[PDB]
Design an enzyme around this catalytic site. Structure first.
Site, PDB file in Angstrom:
ATOM      1  N   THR H   1       0.553 -18.642  15.854  1.00 40.39           N
ATOM      2  CA  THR H   1      -0.400 -18.277  14.457  1.00 40.39           C
ATOM      3  C   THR H   1      -0.103 -19.130  13.357  1.00 40.39           C
ATOM      4  O   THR H   1       1.087 -19.514  13.162  1.00 40.39           O
ATOM      5  CB  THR H   1      -0.067 -16.780  14.067  1.00 40.39           C
ATOM      6  OG1 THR H   1      -0.375 -15.795  15.350  1.00 40.39           O
ATOM      7  CG2 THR H   1      -0.698 -16.389  12.862  1.00 40.39           C
ATOM      8  N   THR H   2      -1.038 -19.250  12.468  1.00 37.40           N
ATOM      9  CA  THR H   2      -1.123 -20.477  11.331  1.00 37.40           C
ATOM     10  C   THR H   2      -2.042 -19.515  10.298  1.00 37.40           C
ATOM     11  O   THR H   2      -3.109 -19.319  10.479  1.00 37.40           O
ATOM     12  CB  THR H   2      -1.538 -21.516  11.416  1.00 37.40           C
ATOM     13  OG1 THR H   2      -0.485 -22.312  12.448  1.00 37.40           O
ATOM     14  CG2 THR H   2      -1.479 -22.490  10.434  1.00 37.40           C
ATOM     15  N   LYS H  33      -7.022 -12.471  12.031  1.00 39.37           N
ATOM     16  CA  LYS H  33      -6.102 -12.296  11.211  1.00 39.37           C
ATOM     17  C   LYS H  33      -6.345 -12.474   9.867  1.00 39.37           C
ATOM     18  O   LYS H  33      -5.365 -12.252   9.165  1.00 39.37           O
ATOM     19  CB  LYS H  33      -4.994 -13.448  11.719  1.00 39.37           C
ATOM     20  CG  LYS H  33      -5.110 -13.965  13.107  1.00 39.37           C
ATOM     21  CD  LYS H  33      -4.332 -14.864  13.657  1.00 39.37           C
ATOM     22  CE  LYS H  33      -4.154 -15.181  15.077  1.00 39.37           C
ATOM     23  NZ  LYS H  33      -3.300 -16.458  15.392  1.00 39.37           N
ATOM     24  N   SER H 129       4.140 -19.571  12.999  1.00 44.11           N
ATOM     25  CA  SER H 129       4.899 -20.602  13.869  1.00 44.11           C
ATOM     26  C   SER H 129       4.224 -22.025  13.379  1.00 44.11           C
ATOM     27  O   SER H 129       5.030 -23.066  13.493  1.00 44.11           O
ATOM     28  CB  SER H 129       4.875 -20.447  15.369  1.00 44.11           C
ATOM     29  OG  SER H 129       3.345 -20.062  15.824  1.00 44.11           O
ATOM     30  N   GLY H 130       3.046 -22.126  12.987  1.00 43.39           N
ATOM     31  CA  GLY H 130       2.653 -23.416  12.670  1.00 43.39           C
ATOM     32  C   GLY H 130       2.768 -23.813  11.173  1.00 43.39           C
ATOM     33  O   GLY H 130       2.332 -24.880  10.716  1.00 43.39           O
TER      34      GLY H 130
END
Lengths: 202, 202, 202, 202, 202, 202, 202, 202, 202, 202
Positions: H1-2, H33, H129-130
């Protein structure tokens, strides 16, 4: 267990009690924890009995061989250093002991050595579960100017205080006096008892 | 298990019961826990049966070889010292045993040795799960001035008390008397039974 | 800790020592472990001090209220039963204690109660770490036909033996004698000391 | 931490040092560990600071309310009993503290109370990590016949010895003297310093 | 423990305190943590005493042998490299120590070496539990242009601050000054005390 | 994080840096850790951000309500006491924070409060991972006789030293000065920067 | 830690920062993480300092010996392969490091090698805790057609971004440029600073 | 996810990718998201999908009810504060999410909120995480003076870089622009694709 | 990772993608997982990169030596058997890999070998985290009667499906075709791309 | 278990196999995993059988009650939302299931819902241990333009591939087709078998 060693002007005084706990009860009231390991050198032991007794035998042999091969006694600091090397070499599979080494070569000396081989010289020291009570007595009453007779009374009082408060300690007190003039002298119990009455310790 | 050893004027008395627990039940009611290992030396065992039996065989061989090579029996203190070295050498992979060694060289002696090689001489000692009950009897009734006959009755009473309170103990009592004049003498069971009736222990 | 209770023809004798270990040393040499909880009922405590003292206060209140509401003293067996219910009700969050209850209602009684509420009547019993040494003395010397004076000497000897072998025990011995004619009588220390000299226990 | 309380003929003397370890370093050199909780009652605290400070506030409120409702001060033994009940009630979610309560109602009293609610009266007591060193001094030098002035010097010497050997202790010594004639009197630091010089403690 | 080493124009200054914790109390107030290991090389130790003392003996022997075999002193960077190899070789069975090496070969040098053999040169460094307090002092007051006399005062102030806040540190401060012109010079305690008074540190 | 609070003659100075670590990296370089919670009261926070921000909101509401209901500001010691009660009440489910409270009621005050509700007054204090470096600076340079202007420079230097050695700290320094005459005054950043240049801290 | 290596037309550019965390604080602000290991070969290190420094010494010796024995430099791919074999051989007792190897044999090359010996060639790569921030910069701005001067500015910007967000990174940036015509050239810090001002990075 | 959110002069730009990992594989390539939760307020979610979707529903209801009851939109800081309270209230049974809230009340605002309720305002922020790759792009290229059109290109480039390096991210990029004049405007995918081609991102 | 090997009438087709995850992110988008190990033999690797690369080097050396010593290529089944023995010999200290071996000796062969040395021949097989998606494609579309050209398209489609659903896979597809007439032929990327467009896979 | 749901122009197709593992063997070859829960709504279940069957009963009751109270069917997205709330509310004591919901309100819809309440709409989805094999088939063969008849053949082929490779799946395939014109229609097994022969799947 309670052991103690102090240094005076030209003497070393060492003393222990005699209670040996085994199988989690007071099996032996009359053990031995103070040993002469050289002409002017003594040793006290605390911790695992089996480990300590083996170490005592090793030290007696090494010091005796040293004195034969080199015609002089091993200096006290060298005694501590030899012990430090042996203990540290097995630090991860250790002798679970705490040791005191005292004696006279050209001056009195007392050394404290732990299970990992740490060795530190001190004017006085005490080991075993009764040691904290001993340090309280020594901190308030020890003096470098004491005579030998005063020092013997001091260590007797210190150990008696420990016996009143540490259940792991007990029994008759053994005392040794080391001087150059007289050598290693184990005080007979009759004088130890006489001093105990004189000091009011019943 | 209950074993006991006491010292008198010129004699050593050793005694055990016979119950051997295995597979968590009373498999063998007639085991052997008291062994003669030299002309004037005896040994009792407590703990792991397999470890103890191996140790008994080792001690018999070593003492026999010693006596052949040096023309005299090994002194009792040396017997204890030899045991202490062997046990301590494997302290981290140990024989899980508690041992009593008793005998006569120039005076009676009893030694207690633990699994880690700690060895302490005593006037009397007791091992096994029934030992605390034995110490109660010995503390209140033992006397150094007892005759051999009185001592045999004392150890019989002490073990009988342990059998009433320690479920791990039981069976017939074996007794050995060691003197210089008569050597190692295993009391026949007929006298043991006769004393048991005479003492009112049914 | 060492506590003991025995039954004779028409009397109950209870006794303890006084050493209270706290912070892993001998902090209090003069504790109290024997309590009167009713006109003809006594109680000894072993284990956690805080739990035991709370239980003593609860029992004094309940027994006093019972006697006021029902005009008679609670029978000894009912005292044990009440204790058993309270301990079992919190068995998974327990009072970590071992208790002895003794007294006279129409006959002498001694009850032993564990932390889980198990209650068993016995002719004699002993609790604490010194108890195994006491059982050895009682097994060899107790007799139902003893007079009160003989019984007091017996419990004194039993506790003295425990003090020689259990480091957790020590101090002066307290003794209580319970009879219908005289009630709960705490023996003054002067007679306890006098008996100790007379019995050769120094 | 080092706290101490002793009883004399008609007085109670209590004393502490001031070092408060937090975040594993010496953050506060001037903490407070000795508190007056009633007209003739004092309290010392060792252990978790937050738990101890909460307990001090609770005790001040309860004792004050008691004295208003019943027109007399709570007796010292009742103070200890109240504390024992509160601590034991949460024994499995406990206040991790060790407490000393001292005061005068009709005689001097000192009580030691542990985290589980165990409460024991004693002639003197000491808590904290420096306590074993204090017991050594008290065992060899305490006397019931000491004057108040002698007692103040004694506790000062005992705490000074602990500060030399326990790294968790340090700072200025606070002393309180409790008598019926004068009440709770906190000794001013100027006399504490003056005594320290006079006793040779620098 | 608190040790420190700083570099100036043509000098290295190293300093420690003397408190040695053993058996979780202040057993030795007068230990030794600063050692000369070569003509112009010094070493400070933190961590396990036994491991550190063994390392000191090894380094003295290796450097002495090096100087005899190659006719010149080992360069300071080579001293650090030799230490790094030895520590890393046993990284999974490690000496649990933190070391500082300082000296002069053609310029002053200070090296910090950890238990895993990581070695980093720095203008100044500090080890032990008191080190964070030292870094605060050095960050705000250190200057590369300081004279030797100013540097000695700086390290004394830094260690004094650590002793006020780190309970593991204490005792008299030892200081060594290393220059090419004068070699390894251990400052006598009389000047250390004199500077302490002059700096207002009592 | 690095926070600090010091007391002067009639003023309190509080200061923090601004770095907020989240998700194990430097996510926010410009956080807020210093808050005004009353007319003459300030607060700094260290530890879990979420717990600290909730506590700040609670304290603002309680103090505001207190001042409305009682017509006077809550005294600083009462502010610390209220915080101590709230934290201790959830000690087993705690706010993982370390707090500093400072202000003026009739004299300046600074209080340090830990997660378990322990509250101790001090002349100065510091929290966060950079605090040990701050204590080194304060120990060597703090003086009670400093002017307000000198104190502001001192806290700036102390925090700057921490930022050089504690990776968890960083960013611009915020400073607040509390006096009765001027109240809570947040120093504008322009003077903070100007002082930083003047002190040679770039 | 932040290290980076990129390949251009006929050049390799490598760069690191200098912060070395030890004892969980910023002990050394001026470490060395970039090393020349051959005439046209460079190496950067991340992870355990001691392990990395040992590896650097091993690689310098092996490459030097290789070039003497075979009259040519070891090819870059062979350098990576040799490293891969050594690391994998101890994969269960590993060097906890991450390495970058870059150089020129007939074309520029950059290799990334992990602790288990995995070796992968890439056009650019980055290691250490600051590496993810570097990859963001490289992904958006790197171009294969960049001149050497453009590449140096790129790596400087990438590392500067990492220093703003990774607390484990910091200090001055070191840069090395490797070409066949000029060999291994360490850029002097004066140009690094000049570029930092020119790029607006203060 | 970013996810990412940035603030400009009078606008807020928020953007995410669409990959939703479930059952440890790429089950849904087209998740959502980014959500509008008020007239001028937006929200991005990272972490557990179920927890995040529940939180989105709660926030939509609360904000809508707030606006109806008070006739104005909830200020952005109050939105963050409300979220902080809800998350902290269940901190030991938490929503495992990381959230970004952005919007306009009288100025643009972006807030980052963690699972424990910590809320910090920032000029820009990124989660998932990005995120570390995004911070590298933002650190080197973000400028407060950018136009809205420049900002949209910036966030697109930042997320594209993350998708190249974070396997947990992927799919089409969604972008929302919030201004007072135009409100919450979700950019149609056709312009997103057109910008992607124009920026050379294929 | 996704690797695949299929057998046709007189050919073997092997294929992989190129993404290499390291340090828990997509560090290398262009790795190598398909290797020629003999004249008519190929190998694919999945799992730990370091272990796999070491195994590839071992197999190249052994096969080359075999062919020199015995004048013929090692048969494919013997290649699998040799691998099986090596892996099983260290099964408790294993290479954590999954391998595919394919080639032609007198007929096409594909072998699958696991970390414990289990070796099974199959008409087709697939390894890595993307393998389950590949098996779905192969189960529905594979046919033994396919031409070489059809087989190449099939493996390309299978790997493309895995890349859409397995985040651990990605990058350009490498394909090798092994026949007796043409030997080991690595398809140039230009045809791979051309087929990808022709198959509608963008 | 293998379940699948796909969306076409104006239809939803859902399908499962029938094998139910219990007591770690194939106890029931003819289970039911596909259920009609509303007029135009279907549901498939994977995971714990007991949890799934309870959820099916709850959904049938809620949807039926909804339709009676509001005169219209619950929209598919609302069905997924209701499920998401129920699962998330017990996320720490969860239903260990994976669910697919599909149906028609004004357009076809398929939703995937996990155990924690995460709900995501998709064009197609698959659950159970056989799902990865299904995704491979769907990725290579699914097309949005397929007729209903083509879609039924596709799901049959996908599940057949899973049954060949996932041991947890097996048995006859059940298929349901949902359209507005015809409603929920369970395909009779006779056509399923006929298609299986026609597709060459035996």
């Amino acid at each position: 267990t309670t052991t103690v060693g102090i240094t005076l002007k030209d003497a070393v005084i060492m003393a222990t009690e005699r209670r040996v706990t085994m199988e989690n009860f007071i099996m032996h009231k009359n053990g031995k924890k103070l040993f002469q390991i050289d002409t002017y050198t003594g040793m006290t032991i605390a911790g695992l009995v089996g480990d300590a007794q083996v170490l005592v035998r090793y030290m007696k042999a090494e010091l005796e061989l040293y004195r034969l091969q080199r015609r002089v006694n091993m200096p006290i600091e060298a005694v501590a250093t030899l012990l430090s090397n042996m203990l540290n070499q097995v630090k991860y599979m250790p002798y679970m002991v705490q040791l005191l080494v005292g004696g006279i070569d050209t001056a009195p000396h007392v050394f404290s050595i732990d299970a990992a081989g740490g060795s530190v010289e001190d004017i006085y020291a005490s080991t075993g579960s009764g040691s904290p009570f001993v340090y309280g007595v020594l901190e308030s009453q020890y003096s470098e100017k004491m005579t030998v007779d005063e020092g013997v009374d001091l260590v007797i009082r210190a150990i008696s205080a420990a016996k009143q408060r540490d259940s792991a300690s007990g029994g008759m007190i053994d005392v040794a006096v080391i001087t150059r003039k007289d050598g290693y002298v184990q005080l007979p119990t009759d004088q130890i008892e006489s001093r105990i009455r004189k000091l009011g310790l019943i």
